[PDB]
Amino acid sequence: AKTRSSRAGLQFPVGRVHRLLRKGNYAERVGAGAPVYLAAVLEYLTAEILELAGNAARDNKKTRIIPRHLQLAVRNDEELNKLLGRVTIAQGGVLPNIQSVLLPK
Amino acid sequence: TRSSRAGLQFPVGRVHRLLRKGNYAERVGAGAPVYLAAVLEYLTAEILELAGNAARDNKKTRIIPRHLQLAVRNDEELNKLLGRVTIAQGGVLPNIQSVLLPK
Amino acid sequence: TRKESYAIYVYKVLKQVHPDTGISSKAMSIMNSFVNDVFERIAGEASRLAHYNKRSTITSREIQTAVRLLLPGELAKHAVSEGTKAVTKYTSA
Amino acid sequence: KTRKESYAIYVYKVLKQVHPDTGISSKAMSIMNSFVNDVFERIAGEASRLAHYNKRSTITSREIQTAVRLLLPGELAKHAVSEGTKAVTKYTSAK
Amino acid sequence: PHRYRPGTVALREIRRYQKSTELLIRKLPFQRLVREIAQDFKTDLRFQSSAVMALQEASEAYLVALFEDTNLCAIHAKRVTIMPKDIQLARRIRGER
Amino acid sequence: HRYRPGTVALREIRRYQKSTELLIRKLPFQRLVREIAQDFKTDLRFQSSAVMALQEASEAYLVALFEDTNLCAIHAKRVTIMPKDIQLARRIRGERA
Amino acid sequence: KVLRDNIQGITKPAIRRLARRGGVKRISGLIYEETRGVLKVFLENVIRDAVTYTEHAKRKTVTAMDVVYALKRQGRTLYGFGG
Amino acid sequence: NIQGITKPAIRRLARRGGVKRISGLIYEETRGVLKVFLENVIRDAVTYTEHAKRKTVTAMDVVYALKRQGRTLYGFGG
DNA sequence: CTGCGCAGGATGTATATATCTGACACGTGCCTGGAGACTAGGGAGTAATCCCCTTGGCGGTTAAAACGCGGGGGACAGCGCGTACGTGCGTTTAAGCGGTGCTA
DNA sequence: AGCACCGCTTAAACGCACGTACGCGCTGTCCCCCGCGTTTTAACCGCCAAGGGGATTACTCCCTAGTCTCCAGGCACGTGTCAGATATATACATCCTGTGCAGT
C-alpha cells in the first residue's frame, strides 16, 4: 500500500495529520510516529463516540445521527462527558433530569 | 541595545529571542519584541507601584509576597487578570461576613 | 474553493461501526469540530512537553504522554494502546 | 554552575522608576518573575492563534496589540496599548 | 370548567423542554439585541446569519446551565422557588463577575 | 472568666487573615504527599521546593474553598459550615459531578 | 435606524422556557430582570471579543468563526459552526 | 497518614477561610477533598517526571501540573 | 347531617396514519496535497565524569495535638400567616414566512 | 449573502383575575460545637553522613527538513429518492372533577 494510513491500518489521513502538525508551530521538527499515533487516537475517539451516538439514534428509532444523539451520547458517558465538560453542542439540548423536591407526593 | 532605542527598561533582545524560539510563528516582526517588552514593562510597573504603596501602608521598606497579594486582590482590574493565580505566601484579604459579627 | 474536512474519515468509521446509519449535516459538522478540538488539545500539550524538556521535536512519545494528561482513564488507556499499536504496525510495514 | 536567566534586574530598575526608596525580597522576586513569564505566554499564545486564524505567518506588533486587547481588562489594556504604541514609535525613531 | 393545580404545568413544561433542542428565545428579538450591543462597541458592523445563531446557541446553553445551578441554590435553602439571590450565589461560586 | 462561644472564633479569623504562614505542619503533609505519589510511581524523590509548591497550592485552594463553602452555609440562613455546603460549592465550581 | 431597549425582546415566557429546560419549577418575579442583566454581561463579553477578532481580520462583517473563537477564549467552546 | 491532616490544622484553614462555626463531619469531608486535589495534581506532576525520565519530581513538574489544572502558582520558577 | 373516598370528564400526550418535501448520499470528473526518492545537516541518544541535592538517622526542648467537661446557642422541626406566582382567558402585538430587490 | 422592505398569517406575548400553596417569621427543644484547663505526642531544629541521581560534555549516526516530479485521494459539483417533518385523526393516561356512601 501507498497511503501511510494503510501502512498503519487506519481510517484517518496520516498525511493530513502530518501537514497540520507542521503548519501549526508546535515544534521545529515533527517525528514520524507522532502523526500516526495521533491520527489513530483521533480515530479511537470518533469511533468511541459514533458508537454511543448510533445507539442513541437507535433508541430514538432513527437512521440518522443528529446532534441530540451526540449530546445524549456524551453526557451519558461519565468519561466522554468530562473530556467535553466545557463544550457546547449546537442543538444538543439537555439530559432529562428533574430534581426530587419538585416532584408531587 | 534597543531597550534604549525604545526608552524601555525591559530587555528588548531577550524578548525577540523568546518569541522566535517558543514556537509562536514561522516569522517574527521587529516591532513586536518592542511592543510586548513594553506591555510587560508597563504591567510590572503597576504591580510594583501598588505593592510598594502597600509596603509603605504596612510600614516596611522591602516588598514581600503579601504586599503583592494585597496590591493584586485590592485592585479590581489586576485581580481579574490574575483571577486564576495563587500567589505563594499571599494570605487572604481580611473579610468577615456581616451575620458572623457580634450583635 | 476547497474546504477540507474529516467528513469522509468520519463516514468510514461510522460505517465500520453502525453500517445502517447516516449522519446529518449538523451532526457531521459537530463531529468535525470535535476532531479539531481534540487535535489542538493534544498537539498543544505535546508542544508544551517538547518545550519543557528543552526539546526541538514532537515524537509519538510526546503525543502519548500528552494523551495521558488530556484524557480520562479508560479513554486514555485504550487510546494509548490503540495508538502505540498503529505505530508498531507502521514501523514494520 | 549553570547560568539560569530571569527578569530580576529589570524588575528592580522598574521598581526604582516607581518607588526609588523601596526594596524587594527574593520570595517576592520569584513572584514578579513568575508573573512576567505567565503574562508573556498568555500574550504570545493569543498572538500565535491570531496569526493562524488569519492564515498569516508573522507575529507583528499589531498581532501583539490585539492579543493585549483580548487578554487585558478595559483600563489596563488601555494604558498597555499606549506604552506599546509609544515605545514602538520611539523605537522606529532611532536606528 | 377545569383547572390544573399550581406546579402541575411547570413539571409538564420542564419535561417538554427537556425532550427537545430547538431554541427558546425568539429569533428576531435575539438578533436586534446582539446588533445593539455590538453597535455600542463599534458602529457599522454586519453579521453572518450563522454568527448570530452561534451566539444564541452559546447564550441559551449558558443560561440553561445557569438555571440548573440557580435551581440547586434554591433547593439548598430549603426553597423550591428560584430568586435573584440564588443566581447571585451561583455566579459568585462559578467565579463570574 | 469565660469568653462567649464564637468570640475567639472571630478573633482567630482576624489573626489568620492577617498572616500568610502555612497552616498544616509540613511533615504530616509531606508524608501524605509521598504516600499519594507512591501509588503512581515507586522509588521517587521530591524536591523540597516541589513539596512547598504543592503545599501552597493546596492550602490556598482549601481556603478559597471554605470561603465559598461558608457562603453556602450563609445562603441557608446557617452559620455553621456542613459537608452539604462543600458538595454544593464544588458541584457548582464543576469540580465534583 | 436607531436601536433602543432591545434587551426587553428577551420576553418573560422565554426566560421561562430556558428555566424549564433548566429544571426550575418555581420562578420568583425578580428573576426576569436579573436574567436580562446576566445575559447582557454575557453577550457583552462574547461580542467584545468576537469584534476584536473582526477588527483584526480588518472586516466590516462578523463571521461565525469570530464568534466561535471568542467562546473558545472565554472557556465556552462551541461545536457546530466551524473550527 | 491522611488523618495526619489534623482537626486543628483544618480549623485554621477554615478560619483564614472566613468560617466561624464548624460541623464535626466537615473534617473528614475536607480530607477526601484534599486527597482528590493532590491526587490529580500529583498524577499530572508525576506524568511530567515519568516523561522527563527522572526519579526526582521537581517543582517545575508540580508548577506545570497546576497550570494544566487551572490553579497556576507563582514563586517556584514561573 | 357531614367528611372522605370513590367514581367520572376533559385535558394533554401519546401515537397511527398518510403525505409532501429537500437533504444526504452517490456517481463523475477534475486538481491539489501527498507520495516517492534523495541529500545534507544537526538533534538527540548514548556513554563517560561529576558533585549537588536528597535522604536519613539521631535526640532536646517546646509548641502543638489531644482529650475531656460543661453549658450555651444554633440547628432543625413544627406551625401558622400572608401573599406572590401559576394558571387560565381574552386581548394584543410582532415573529416567522418566503418573495423581491440592491450593493457592500 | 447580508440588509432592507412588505404583507399575509397566527403563534406567541401581554395583561388581568383569582386563590393556592409556598416564602418566611415565630417558636421551641435538644445537642452539637466552642471554650478552656490539663495530659499526651510528635513537629521541629540543629548536626552530620553517604550515595543516588541529575547535571554537564564530547561523539556519531539516525532521522527529519528541504527539495522535485509525479498522480490519485479528496473535493465540488450535479442529481435522484427516501428519511423525516408536517397535518390530521384517534386511542390511553391522569389530574381533578363532582358525585355517593360511609360513619358519627
Automatic annotation (TrEMBL), chain B:
Keyword terms: Acetylation, Chromosome, DNA-binding, Isopeptide bond, Nucleosome core, Nucleus, Phosphoprotein, Ubl conjugation
GO biological process terms on file: heterochromatin formation
Record's subcellular location: Chromosome; Nucleus
Main location: nucleus
Any one GO MF annotation of this record: protein heterodimerization activity
Keyword ATP-binding applies: no
Domain (Core Histone H2A/H2B/H3): residue spans on this chain: 1-73
CC terms in the record's Gene Ontology section: nucleosome; nucleus
Ranges for domain Histone H2A C-terminal: 76-103
Task of the protein: Core component of nucleosome. Nucleosomes wrap and compact DNA into chromatin, limiting DNA accessibility to the cellular machineries which require DNA as a template. Histones thereby play a central role in transcription regulation, DNA repair, DNA replication and chromosomal stability. DNA accessibility is regulated via a complex set of post-translational modifications of histones, also called histone code, and nucleosome remodeling.
Subunit structure: The nucleosome is a histone octamer containing two molecules each of H2A, H2B, H3 and H4 assembled in one H3-H4 heterotetramer and two H2A-H2B heterodimers. The octamer wraps approximately 147 bp of DNA.
Family according to the record: Belongs to the histone H2A family.
Protein name: Histone H2A
Covered residues, full protein: 17 to 119 of 130
